[PDB]
Amino acid sequence: DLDVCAREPIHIPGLIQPYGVLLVIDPADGRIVQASTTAADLLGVPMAALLGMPYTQVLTLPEAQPFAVDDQPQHLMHAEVRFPQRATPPASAWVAAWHLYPQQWLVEMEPRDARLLDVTLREAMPLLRSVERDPGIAEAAVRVAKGLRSLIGFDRVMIYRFDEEWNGDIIAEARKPELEAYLGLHYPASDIPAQARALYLRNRVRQIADVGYQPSPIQPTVHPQLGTPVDLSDVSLRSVSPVHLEYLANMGVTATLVASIVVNDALWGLISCHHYSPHFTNHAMRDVTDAVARTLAGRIGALQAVARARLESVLLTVREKLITTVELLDDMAPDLMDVVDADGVAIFHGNDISRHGTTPDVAALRRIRDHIGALHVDAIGEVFPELADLAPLAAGFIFVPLMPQSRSALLWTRREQIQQIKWAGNPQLAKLEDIPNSRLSPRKSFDLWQQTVRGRARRWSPLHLESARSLRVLIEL
Ligand SMILES: */C=C\C1=C(C)C(=O)N/C1=C\C1=NC(=C\c2[nH]c(/C=C3/NC(=O)C(C=C)=C3C)c(C)c2CCC(=O)O)/C(CCC(=O)O)=C1C
């Protein structure tokens, strides 16, 4: 636990959420080799009798039928399923999705609905058509948060943006006014382990119908003929870590819905819904949620392309203007904070400094210059702690000396991460409090992040690094 949990095999818990049923089927004979404890009361045949039974004898599949797959798996959408054995039919109608692998067929089934009416795309359409014509990622993120809360009735809807090192920042939130506010909160990467993110990208939408469900074990835990656990990696019924259930129980959240914000086949952030009352999200709502997640991800990517095209163009102007210095570079200094975005820029001439953005004094910058293709840092004190007192304003730099002839040089800076916290947007954030007797909480998470990012810049160092360094190579003129 705690450090061991960071590498938990969450894809193979041999447990599922009891709102559903899972059967593991042998593609050859078609026999149910393994099944959830839940399979007995639904299919109406005892668990022992059910194991080794050809799936044909226990469930009628009107719409889609399973088939032998050769290489890559095929995942069939949730379709009508009926149970030929059971005397009295179930309360609600059931639906079934197949996960076809070469060695196994995994059938997962859950109720079509909670005796409830589905949201339609037709209903989601004004949201989708609007979240695509919104200027800026922020503005669209908040439209999604509100729209989704109203569309799929939820107590809280939160939009997260992951950073370079996988730390999360709640950028949008829409909630009950009687509820609190987590807008502006930043949590560390460790809060969502590498596999937890993986499985969020893989399944497009993850649900926890009731925190504090009594797990349904898969019996036998491992395949009788293959001896392996069940890879619930594609199974939405997959049980949740006792560590996330601990976490959510502390907040009183009793049901979640997490959709992926996938941009350029990468997990950009997450659309996360939180209910304080149990809430099963049927397949139809899940799909509509994914339709929303995709439209928001589609728009943030479109804006990201627009920004990237601008960054290449500002660089295109800088290189064509260097064909015609120091002040020649100083005039294009706000633009120099775009090609390689940064809080501030501080050109050096020899002792004369010129700060243009959010940069520390003039005395401070000189101290940095005298300490030092082109050197860069993420923590101004890890390389030398004599400059650790000026980690705010400049915690991360890119010192690119032009030549040893002229004492001319460039220094890009980025403020301490804790400075760029949107406290204005949600004043609750500072006066926020911990959960009484808990080892995991949102308030406790903010502080853990603060620790792992104290004295650390806003990460940076991507394509900006060599694009910045190119200018040193460009000095040969
Ligand atoms: C050992 C690792 C974990 C620690 C430590 C921990 O706190 N949770 C760990 C494992 C998992 N977290 C998962 C999902 C998840 N956790 C969070 C954490 C938060 N930090 C915050 O500040 C807040 C609120 C203010 C929260 C809720 C978040 C945001 C997520 C994403 C899901 C969600 O938004 O509700 C998971 C996956 C859960 C599963 O479905 O199995 C694991 C394993």
- Here the CATH number for the domain that contains residue 81 is 3.30.450.20
Look up residue 317 and give its two tokens.
């102007």
Distance CA 163, CA 158 (A): 16
Distance CA 35, CA 223 (A): 10
Supply the range of the domain harboring residue 387. 306-420+453-474
Q: How far is CA 167 from the centre of its chain?
A: 9
Distance CA 64, CA 158 (A): 35
Closest alpha carbon to 390 in 398, 400, 379: 379
Query: What's 390's domain CATH number?
Result: 3.30.450.270
Strand bridging mode 156-162 / 266-275: antiparallel
Q: Give Rg (Cα) of the chain.
A: 27
Backbone angles phi and psi of 392, in degrees to 5:
-70, 155
Which ligand 1 atom is nearest residue 168's CA?
29
**Contact 445 CB / ligand 1 (< 6 Å):** yes
Look up residue 44 and give its two tokens.
């109406």
Residue 273, marked binder: no
Do the beta carbons of residue 430 and residue 423 sit within 8 Å?
yes
How far, in Å, is the centroid of ligand 1 from the Cα of 187?
9
Burial class (CB in 10 A: 0-12, 13-18, 19+), 166: middle
Residue nearest atom 40 in ligand 1 by C-alpha distance: 240
**Contact 6 CB / ligand 1 (< 6 Å):** yes
Distance CA 418, CA 373 (A): 30
Distance CA 96, CA 319 (A): 59
Q: How far is CA 456 from the centre of its chain?
A: 22
Distance CA 135, CA 144 (A): 13
Which residue(s) pair with 329 in the sheet? none
Do the beta carbons of residue 173 and residue 158 sit within 8 Å?
yes
Residue nearest atom 22 in ligand 1 by C-alpha distance: 442
How far, in Å, is the centroid of ligand 1 from the Cα of 350?
50
Resolution, given in Å to one decimal, reads: 3.0
Three-state SS for 449? Answer: helix
**Contact 421 CB / ligand 1 (< 6 Å):** no
396-401, strands of its sheet edge to edge:
353-355, 344-348, 409-414, 396-401, 376-377
Closest alpha carbon to 335 in 306, 356, 352: 356
**Which positions ≥6 away from 476 have C-beta within 8 Å?**
none
Do the beta carbons of residue 468 and residue 337 sit within 8 Å?
no
**Contact 256 CB / ligand 1 (< 6 Å):** yes
Closest alpha carbon to 78 in 68, 90, 93: 93
Look up residue 404 and give its two tokens.
């040893």
In the chain, count H helices and then E strands: 12, 19
Q: Which residue out of 192, 213, 238, 440 has the highest number of ligand 1 atoms within 8 Å of its CB and is therefore the one to mutate? A: 192
Three-state SS for 48? Answer: helix
How far, in Å, is the centroid of ligand 1 from the Cα of 247?
7
Do the beta carbons of residue 151 and residue 128 sit within 8 Å?
no
